[PDB]
Structures are given as C-alpha cells and as structure tokens.
Design a protein around this motif. Structure first.
Motif, PDB file in Angstrom:
ATOM      1  N   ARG A  53       0.823  -1.203   0.000  1.00  0.00           N
ATOM      2  CA  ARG A  53       0.000   0.000   0.000  1.00  0.00           C
ATOM      3  C   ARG A  53       0.860   1.257   0.000  1.00  0.00           C
ATOM      4  O   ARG A  53       0.548   2.216  -0.712  1.00  0.00           O
ATOM      5  N   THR A 103       2.425   1.636  -3.500  1.00  0.00           N
ATOM      6  CA  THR A 103       1.440   2.114  -4.466  1.00  0.00           C
ATOM      7  C   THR A 103       1.151   3.586  -4.255  1.00  0.00           C
ATOM      8  O   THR A 103       1.076   4.346  -5.225  1.00  0.00           O
ATOM      9  N   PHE A 104       0.992   3.988  -2.987  1.00  0.00           N
ATOM     10  CA  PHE A 104       0.753   5.384  -2.624  1.00  0.00           C
ATOM     11  C   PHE A 104       1.877   6.280  -3.101  1.00  0.00           C
ATOM     12  O   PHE A 104       1.628   7.331  -3.702  1.00  0.00           O
ATOM     13  N   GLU A 144       2.089   6.260  -7.203  1.00  0.00           N
ATOM     14  CA  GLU A 144       0.991   7.041  -7.768  1.00  0.00           C
ATOM     15  C   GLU A 144       1.082   8.511  -7.389  1.00  0.00           C
ATOM     16  O   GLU A 144       0.721   9.369  -8.196  1.00  0.00           O
TER      17      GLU A 144
END
Lengths: 404, 91, 211
Positions: free
Chosen positions: C45, C48-49, C52
C-alpha cells in the motif's frame, strides 16, 4: 592469364620475337586448361565431402585428363613417373630460395597424428538434443526456481565435494567444474558461494577452506563454455581474500602452504590480467592496490609478503619497471627484522620469504637486460643483497637457455 | 478505484466503478572492489532461494516516467495481486 | 489480503500525516515508518501510494509533495525489519522520475527543484547500494539510463543536472569513466553562459547550476 607473362616465358626459353596474336594464342589455351581442371578438381572435392579443394584434388583431376600430375618435371619416356603424383612442390613466394643442407637434417620431424577411431554419441534423445560436449552447446502463481532438482542436487554434491573432505572427490569435482558445458545458469550460485565463503572463512584463517576455494576458482576459470566476466567483480576480492592478508591461525608453520596458495592466487590474477581486459579497469586497478600496499609504513609482514608475490608474478615488463627504484627499502626492512629486538611476530619468517622472492626476481630481470660480466662485486652497488648467489642463479638460467 | 490508492483516485476525481558498450557497465569495471579484500581483519524442494520473478525477469524499467507530457505508452491502474510466495502474509 | 481496521486506520493516519498540514506530525510519522517492527502487509500500500503520488506530479507540479514523498521513501529505507526487495521495482522509477524529469516546479525560476534533485540522487545511490545484485542488475541499468540521458543532446539542463547528480552520487569510478570523457561538453555549456545574446531566459541559472 596475362599475355605479358607469356612473353617473359617465351623469351626466357629461346623463342624470341613473338607477335601479340601469337602470344594471345597461348594465354587462352592454357587458361582454358586451368579452367577445365579446376572444374574437374571440384568433382573430387564434392565427392570427398570436404568442400576444401585440397592439393591432391588437382593430382586426380590431372590424371583424369591423361596428363601426369608431374609438377616441375616432365618425363618424355613416362616410365619412372607414370600418373602417380609426387605431392607437388612445397614452395613459397616469400621463400629464401637457398637453404643449408644440414639445416633440414637437424630440425625435428613433425608428430604423426592419431589414427582414425570410431566413437559414438547421441544427437537426439527422443527428439531432444543433449548438451554433451560432442554437441554444439488475485494471487500471482507460485514460481519455480530456475534450477532443476538435478541441478540443485548436482550443485550440492559439487560444493560438498569441493570443501575437500576426500581428495579424489575434490579432484573429480574440480574436473567437473572445469569441463561441464551446462555449468552456466548455475554460475551466480557458485560465485556467491566462493565470495561469501572466503569472507566468513578469513574471520578464522582456515587455510584448507581457502586452498579448496582457490582451486575452485581456478577450475571455474579454465572452463571454456561459461561467460565469466559478469562475475569477476565479486570474484576478484574473494580469490584475493587471503593473499597479503594475515593469518588468524598458526602463521609460522603452514606459512609454507599459505605461501603456495598465494602463488596459486598470483597465477589466477595473471590469467585474469591476460583475459577480461579492457582499457584501464582491471589490471591497472589491482596494480595500483598492490603498489599502495607496498609503499606503506609499518606494513603487515605476512602482508609484506603476499603483496610482494602479487606484484612479482605480473610478467616481464612489470618487474622491469616496478621492482627497480625500491631495493634500498627492501634492504632496510630486512636489517630491522635482523636487529630484533624480540620475535613478537613471525616478522623474521616474513622477511626471509620476501627477500628470497625479491632476489630471484632481480636475478631473472638482470639476466634478461645485460651481459653476465662482473658477477662478483658489481651487485654491491645495489646494496649487496643477492650478489654472487644472484650471479649463480643467473648462470643457472643461462644453462637452462643453453639446454633450450 | 476503491482499492489501495483510493485516496489518490478520489483526489483526482475519477469514478468509473563505444562508452555504451555493455562491459563499461559491468560492476567489475565500475566498483572499487579492492576495498572489500579483508586484510588483518579484527533435496525434496530446493536448497536454492525463490526470488521475485518480476524483479528478476520483468522490465520494471518500463514503469519509469522519463517525460510526463510525452508518456511513450499509456499506463493503467494496477490491481493488488497479494503474491502468496512471500512468507509473513497469512494468505 | 484485507487490511484489518487497526492497520487501515494506521495507513490512513500515516499517509495523511505526510501531506503537509504540519511538520511535527510529519516528523513523527516518518519516525514511525522508519522505526516500527511490523509494517509488512502495509508495504504494498505504501509503495502504491508513493508511486501514484509521484505520478500525480504531472497533473500538479508540486515540489513540496514530491519532497514529502522522497522523505517517505528515505524513511522506508531506514526500517531494519521490512525488506524492500520485492517492492523496489516500484520505488526505483518514482525516485528516477524525481531525478530526471524536466519540470519539477510550478514556478520554474524560483523553486529549488535542484535539492529534490540531489536528495533523490543520494536516495537512488543508496537504493542501488543496498539492493544491487548480479541477478538484479539494478546499478548497471540505472547507470545506463543516466548515461544515455546525459550523452544524448536535446536534453534540458534540468534533466542533465539530474543525470550528472545521480552519476556523481554513485561513486568515484563512475565519474572517472562516465563524466570525465564529456568534460569538453563544458565548453558547449559555456557557449551559452559567458556569451549571449539572450540573457533573461532560464537557460542560465540551470547552466551554471550544472557547471
């Protein structure tokens, strides 16, 4: 063929004043006979399955056209030399055209090669070509290792044999490393096993563990199939993990076996300098390390020795340039060990080994660039280290040269 | 949209759902490996470790964004794949 | 698989503490990320954070949020318990985007994109010191991208600054065998510095920063 070569032949025979149409008449007749024979000698090449057109094909192409493969001599009576050939004339364009008649006798005859034998192997096993040396060579899915379980077993057996519990096991495993064609794609795991091993094997100076790993490196290098210079980066420190480096074990005795290991390491380093070589990356980098190992005050004496050996085995010119301006420092170090005061460290053993190695290299360099005149006391201009014994070593080298 | 990175999606407001020769770069020719030399220091499955196939094999280099305006390819939202090869994950 | 409410709340608080409301909560969140033992199962997570969020710089050229995401990556690297080997393929191009992109600023002239350059260059030197293996080929690929971005002409002075910064943070032998052959390029730089005719463009501050 050119006509200006046919007039040279005619006037060197007694037939002078030949016309150009007479001379052009010669060079289209003989150029046809060369074309007729070379087309006819290609039949023997295609029936030989050799695609070579050897020198014997023209001997059979001439005999086929009822012309004697007699070369350089023609017998008008035909009887001592019939259509049997004499193998041509071994002549050159850049030849000397005059030899001494005892030069041909005293040269050694070439070795008659091996006779023809019949060996069988396998091109295909039920459709698949084996890699023997007689052949040219949402949840994501659970992945498989890129080695087979024969390959991990093989790798496990070879590594457990190469740690030298039994000597015949080692020697086969070393030959298996030296000639397995499929030992690529296992080579990262071998390089990592070597590198990691030396670094946790110099924490306690375990000589055999190291002598076996250096033999494994030497067996990895002479394998012709695998591509090594992707792995040489990790390997250079691992092979050299204990060359100059001191011994946490009993340094004074096995100092013989570890010195032999250092000699083996020097040889592998020289092979590496000969190969994997690009501009100013590998050889100059290890040369710079070795020199700043040498030009160090209060140098580790087990190390005053490994780095000395490393620098010494680098070839002809390297000792011709790097082992010249430093004799006085070597002599001063020897004098300090000799003074004492007490043998706190194997300093004396290190000094004797370093002096002997340096003296042998200095003899060979001297024998190489200078005559053997005044071999008694002229070496006293170089602090008198090896002197007459160095002169005797040079004389032994000269005797070996005479034997050669 | 509702998975990990939902915060980014909501902030955006999207609602559907010769010196280049290979040797120069080999780390034997680019690493001071002479510092490593230690001087005077003081089966059933596999005996081989399973590596990330994506790192070992995939071209992750294709997710680098060299120019924001000229993105040579069009990138897509990535779904969570929860690889089970990794231990320390209950499932 | 399904984040539990405990770690869902921890993920929410830690990510919203690094968006820029205040600095003290950010420092405590980064000291949480760097020094907690059980943050696995929340590493994908965070990756990905971060990736992105660095991508969302193209819609809004926010220098500050990129500095915050690079300090998030630098805090993720200092954690002894979690191993970033399985997720480094996501964090490498994010730091690379912070290095070699050309518009890192909203106002190009006054924003010091230059520091997010040398900070991310130090970060990528650390990420290819800790993780480069001969099976990975991380460092050789990173040097090849930096090299073909530097040797190739038409590249802006910002991306050339990023390339030179990363290559010079890799080490001494890299600047021996990559930077020193193209030292004549400094003449091509001083073509546009000592000698005009245009002066009031932005191609002078970036050029003498590169110099």
């Amino acid at each position: 063929l050119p006509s200006e070569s046919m007039k040279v032949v005619a006037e060197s025979m007694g037939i002078a004043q030949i016309q150009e149409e007479t001379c052009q008449l010669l060079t289209d007749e003989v150029s046809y006979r060369i074309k007729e024979i070379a087309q006819d000698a290609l039949k023997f090449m295609h029936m030989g399955k050799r695609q070579k057109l050897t020198t014997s094909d023209i001997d059979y192409a001439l005999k086929l056209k009822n012309v004697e493969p007699l070369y350089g001599f023609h017998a008008q009576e035909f009887i001592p030399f019939r259509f049997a050939s004499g193998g041509g004339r071994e002549l050159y364009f850049y030849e000397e055209k005059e030899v001494d008649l005892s030069d041909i006798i005293n040269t050694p005859l070439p070795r008659v090669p091996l006779d023809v034998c019949l060996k069988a192997h396998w091109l295909s096993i039920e459709g698949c070509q084996p890699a023997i040396p007689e052949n040219p060579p949402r949840l994501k899915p659970r992945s498989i290792h890129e080695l087979s379980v024969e390959q991990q077993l093989y790798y496990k057996e070879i590594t457990e044999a190469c740690v030298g519990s039994c000597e015949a096991k080692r020697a086969e495993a070393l030959q298996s490393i030296a000639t397995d064609p499929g030992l690529y794609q296992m080579l990262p795991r071998f390089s990592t096993f070597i590198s990691e091993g030396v670094r946790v094997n110099v924490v306690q100076n375990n000589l055999a563990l190291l002598i076996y790993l250096m033999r494994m490196v030497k067996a990895l290098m002479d394998n012709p199939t695998l591509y090594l210079e992707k792995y040489v980066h990790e390997l250079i420190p691992a092979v050299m993990t204990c060359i100059v480096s001191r011994q946490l074990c009993l340094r004074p005795d096995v100092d013989n076996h570890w010195a032999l290991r250092d000699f083996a390491a020097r040889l592998v380093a020289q092979i590496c300098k000969h190969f994997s070589t690009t501009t100013n990356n590998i050889q100059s980098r290890i040369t710079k390390t070795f020199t700043k190992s040498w030009v160090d005050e209060k140098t580790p004496w087990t190390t005053r020795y490994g780095s000395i050996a490393g620098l010494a085995e680098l070839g002809h010119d390297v000792i011709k340039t790097l082992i010249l301006p430093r004799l006085q420092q070597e002599g001063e170090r020897i004098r300090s060990v000799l003074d004492g005061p007490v043998l706190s460290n194997i300093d004396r053993i290190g000094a004797d080994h370093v002096q002997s190695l340096l003296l042998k290299h200095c003899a060979p360099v001297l024998a190489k660039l200078r005559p053997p005149p005044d071999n008694q006391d002229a070496y006293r201009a170089e602090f008198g280290s090896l002197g007459p014994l160095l002169c005797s070593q040079v004389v032994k080298a000269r005797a070996q040269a005479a034997l050669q | 949209r509702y998975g990990p990175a939902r915060l980014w999606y909501d902030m955006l407001g999207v609602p559907e759902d010769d010196l280049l020769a290979d040797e120069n770069f080999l780390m034997v020719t680019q690493l001071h490996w002479e510092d490593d030399i230690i001087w005077d220091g003081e089966p059933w499955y596999s005996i081989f470790p399973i590596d990330n196939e994506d790192l070992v094999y995939g071209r992750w280099e294709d997710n680098i964004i060299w120019d924001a305006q000229a993105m040579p390819r069009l990138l897509e939202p990535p779904v969570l794949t929860l690889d089970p090869n990794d231990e320390n994950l209950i499932l």
